[PDB]
Ligand binder design. Structure first.
Ligand SMILES: CCCCCCCCO[C@@H]1O[C@H](CO)[C@@H](O)[C@H](O)[C@H]1O
Ligand SMILES: CCCCCCCCO[C@@H]1O[C@H](CO)[C@@H](O)[C@H](O)[C@H]1O
Lengths: 63, 66, 69, 53
């Protein structure tokens, strides 16, 4: 029963590879979504600093 | 001649008086509405500075959290 | 989740601030114009007033030259 | 008034910065939709290749 066992090995792997490939894409997409969210945040933070800076330099030229 | 030229000279003096009161009063009504407009630039800029200040704080209150 | 929660409340708040600030410059532009119109009407009225009086003076002189010459 | 430039502009730059971020994120969302579906088509065929075989 070599064809019987060679056949089943083919079957188990095609499921397992399918899963391995689907798991490793989401590994990559998720880490990537995180990084992308970090940069989105550094940016809106730097917008805040920016805006508070210009408010402080407006403030220090009246009384 | 002399009666009537004393009419004309009077008249003119009366006219000079009105013309100065007019230039006077135009310059007033102007300057005033000029002032009113400068107060308004200032108040509008106050409203703007607060709006942008409040959104700035908001962000700095939030980037505090994260 | 709040990628989108805090980004959109910000963006709304910005576009609004800008709306408001732009509305304020516009209101006060029509006001510059309304005021220029007020000043022009006044200067005009006066200047043409002076012109009428000198008009009347010129009529007198002329009437004098005629009843004379 | 030069102050009003500063402030207005600080709003206009904030909006600009993050209307653009979206633009770019949005094009990219599209490209990923396409690429992912090509990975799914291929996994599918992988299995079907090594089953019917
Ligand atoms: C009835 C009159 C009320 C006057 C209110 C004026 C408030 C204007 O507000 C402020 O005026 C300061 C000085 O002119 C400026 O330095 C500031 O930039 C301006 O925002
Ligand atoms: C591990 C190395 C990762 C490198 C970090 C990437 C640097 C940020 O590059 C990013 O590209 C984005 C694409 O959506 C643009 O939207 C942004 O403008 C920008 O911050």
């Amino acid at each position: 029963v070599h064809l019987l066992e060679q056949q089943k090995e083919q079957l188990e792997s095609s499921l397992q590879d399918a899963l391995a490939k689907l798991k490793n894409r989401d590994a990559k997409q998720t880490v990537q979504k995180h990084i992308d969210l970090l940069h989105t945040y550094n940016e809106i933070r730097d917008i805040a600093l920016g805006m508070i800076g210009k408010v402080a330099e407006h403030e220090k030229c009246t009384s």
